[PDB]
From a paper:
pmcAlcohol dehydrogenases (ADHs EC 1.1.1.1) are NAD(P)H‐dependent medium‐chain oxidoreductases found in all kingdoms of life. These enzymes typically catalyse the reversible reduction of aldehydes or ketones to the corresponding alcohol. The structural motifs of ADHs are highly conserved in all known eukaryotic examples; most notably, a zinc ion involved in catalysis, a second zinc ion involved in maintaining protein structure, and the Rossmann peptide‐fold involved in cofactor binding. ADHs have been shown to catalyse many complex biochemical transformations in plant natural product biosynthesis, suggesting that their catalytic repertoire has been expanded.
We also report the structure of the ADH [name] (GS) that catalyses an atypical 1,2‐iminium reduction. GS catalyses the irreversible 1,2‐iminium reduction of strictosidine aglycone to form geissoschizine, another intermediate in vinblastine biosynthesis. GS and THAS (47.7 % and 53.8 % amino acid identity to DPAS respectively) each crystallised with both the catalytic and structural zinc ions bound. Mutagenesis of GS residues involved in the coordination of the catalytic zinc (His73 and Cys168) resulted in the abolishment of GS activity, suggesting that, as in the canonical ADH mechanism, the catalytic zinc is essential for 1,2‐reduction of the iminium. Additionally, GS and THAS each had mutations in highly conserved residues involved in the proton relay observed in canonical ADH reduction. Moreover, GS contains a Phe residue in this position (Phe53). No substantial change in reduction activity was observed for GS Phe53Tyr mutant or the corresponding THAS Tyr56Phe mutant, suggesting the hydroxyl‐group has no catalytic role. Although THAS Glu59 is positioned 3.6 Å from the 2′O of bound‐NADP+, GS Glu56 is positioned 7.6 Å from this moiety which is not consistent with a role for this residue in cofactor binding or catalysis. GS has been reported to be able to reduce precondylocarpine acetate, albeit it at substantially reduced efficiency compared to DPAS.
Residue numbers in the entry:
A (entry chain B): 8 to 129, 134 to 363
B (entry chain A): 9 to 129, 132 to 361
The structure:
């Protein structure tokens, strides 16, 4: 009896970054392992850049996927969390050292030795844009019954990235006024989380066309175009926090600091592109802070999903077949999707 | 009503030529404390303010945010201070008293602070503590601990509070923490001494190789590194819970300070802003690191800081001078030729 787990995934074989199918094996499920039939895989800006090795974290062959939703088809004998049939998800990590202070305190995303699903080096692994995953139960998330997997799968990226810093800073309280720069996947979900927390959300966007969806769909309290200097001046000193989802350096730090109240925080989550110019005087005079954040701990992933489910929050998602992946990447780059693609792996990814 | 006849030192205009300035203080109201000034600290801030370096200076200008003296009179409703008590006044003599910051004891972040030296941070016209007498609302008067000398201690009102406040806010005032300190002057040296007394570890990064001995032997630093020693700094990557930057803003690379931090580390900027920092986002994001600024402290923090310094016998290295040396002292302050602060003996030399 051949036990091996045959898999196929999409990514790049070479540094050229040309998208291709990649055949490989998953390990046989150990006693604590969960074998997952992948139903949906999110794709985002991060994946699009990783395939071209924008940041030097990519090892080839490279199968992307840090946004994975599926169903349990097999469990190891000592698995307690999940049974066959259960809907589950996997985020950016499939392992950590488990003995460092970060791991002990539930911040596995800041383990010095993370085991990334897509194998990014910042074990040799293949990501969730594949037919099947085998993952230790610790790193598998329970999927809430009331969330659809197709529209929800992007929460694993869009959701956790914004939820984690807001919780860390204690901004997830009623009454807080939070500004959000850039209304894409992260931006839109941030607005929806802020409203559900009982806060007030202001959107600053480069796209005037997004006013309607910001106000009418996401429930933002205000929408401001980034070039509207007089309106931005008027919002000086009004925000408990600012969430910057724009590429690092594309929004002036001086603007973001000026919008903050005393003790306010700028939360940088966007991909670094260029240096910020940082004036010290606003930080010092206002005891303001700038903080960065990447993904979230395992607990935060689960809490985020449970929260989204409670308030019926999803990410605006376009569901596509695997054969459209090349075009999807182009649309991601051109900011021509509202706001994320989800790949229907379960129905469209096939062998040979 | 005006009453108390007063003399202070400062400048009449932007030339910054030091002179005596004659004025009157108000009669103590019911909540006021009249203070005979015994010592006044002077520092970089004062030296620059007299020349209006930053445009905050209103003339005539009598500096002094580091004032220690004794109570000679109190208003009828003051109970906390009695005649004869040793006291101090810091940078503020008033605030709006009704904003969230004021209510939560962070008067230094009131939108409408009343500065001792009258610097426009609006704000009421005032003359600072480099004067023979002060009249101050009891709320803004500090109790001076008996076991600290006023002459060597008065600089704590500036050097001490500025570094103590952010470390407390960030929870860095705990045993085991490793804190880096850029610039070993008044703030730097006192920071080291606080860090050690908190039970932490202090590394000093300085531009002056000659300060190695005093850093280790006098202040109790665990390590000393020259700022141009790239290889040593590389080796300290990822070791520090916090970095205190006392250098002028923009003089220390932000990339260096971020690189020195551990996961969840904080950069604390307290130095006078001079030029923009270049901020790379990647270290912040990857390490969940933070950059914060801080200015002076709340009234409670001033008092806690003094009480703490007293408990551990912490003072600032101070050169005590007469008022007639003030012109030369300003020059030495600018040339970084004092270890590390001047205190003026007002009580005995200002007539
Ligand atoms: N920290 C983490 O853990 C983490 C994890 C995943 C992703 N990220 C990063 O988070 C960022 C946002 O993710 P996303 O999926 O929402 O990205 P996205 O769809 O590529 O862009 C989000 C929005 O940012 C604004 N924007 C994009 N490019 C811009 C530019 N050059 N100048 C100014 N504004 C620009 C646009 O908003 P408007 O149309 O409103 O102007 C756009 O809709 C990306 O940089 C991504 O790499 C970070
Ligand atoms: N945030 C606040 O509330 C507040 C309040 C008062 C003062 N301050 C500011 O805090 C800073 C420190 O005060 P201080 O009285 O300790 O200052 P200082 O005696 O003028 O300078 C302190 C030390 O900083 C270093 N330094 C000075 N100029 C430098 C330069 N151009 N480049 C690099 N390093 C330089 C030197 O250390 P090394 O010899 O070791 O290199 C010097 O001994 C000043 O900028 C002061 O204005 C802030
Ligand atoms: Zn670990
Ligand atoms: Zn993603
Ligand atoms: Zn106030
Ligand atoms: Zn001072």
């Amino acid at each position: 009896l051949d036990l091996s787990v045959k898999a196929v995934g999409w990514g790049a074989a070479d540094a050229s970054g040309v998208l291709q199918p990649i055949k490989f094996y998953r390990r046989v499920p150990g006693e604590r392992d969960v074998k997952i039939r992948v139903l949906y895989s999110g794709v985002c800006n991060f994946d699009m850049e990783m395939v071209r090795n924008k940041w030097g974290f990519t090892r080839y062959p490279y199968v992307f996927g840090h946004e994975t939703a599926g169903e349990v088809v097999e469990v190891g004998s000592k698995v307690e969390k999940f049974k066959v049939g259960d809907k589950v998800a996997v985020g950016c990590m499939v392992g950590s050292c488990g003995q460092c202070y970060n791991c002990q305190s539930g911040m596995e995303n800041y383990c010095p030795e993370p085991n990334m699903a897509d194998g990014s080096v910042y074990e040799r692994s293949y990501g969730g844009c594949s037919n099947v995953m085998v993952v230790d139960e610790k790193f598998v998330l329970r999927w809430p019954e009331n969330l659809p997997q197709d529209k929800g799968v992007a929460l694993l990226c869009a959701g956790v990235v914004v939820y984690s810093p807001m919780k860390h800073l204690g901004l997830d309280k009623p009454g807080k006024h939070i500004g959000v720069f850039g209304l894409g996947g992260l931006g839109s979900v941030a607005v929806k989380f802020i409203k559900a927390f009982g806060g007030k959300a202001t959107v600053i966007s480069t796209s005037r066309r997004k006013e309607k969806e910001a106000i009418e769909e996401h429930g933002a309290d205000a929408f401001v175009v980034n070039t509207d200097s007089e309106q931005l001046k008027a919002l000086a000193g009004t925000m408990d926090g600012v969430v910057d989802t724009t590429p690092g350096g594309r929004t002036p730090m001086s603007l973001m600091l000026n919008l903050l109240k005393f003790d306010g925080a700028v939360m940088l989550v966007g991909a670094p592109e260029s240096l910020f110019e940082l004036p010290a005087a606003p930080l010092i005079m206002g005891r303001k802070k700038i903080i960065g954040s990447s993904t979230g701990g395992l607990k935060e992933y689960q809490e985020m999903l449970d929260f989204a489910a409670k308030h019926n929050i999803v990410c605006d998602t376009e569901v596509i077949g695997i054969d459209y992946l090349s075009t999807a990447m182009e649309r991601i780059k051109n900011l021509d999707v509202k706001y994320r693609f989800a790949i229907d792996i379960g129905n469209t990814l096939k062998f040979e």
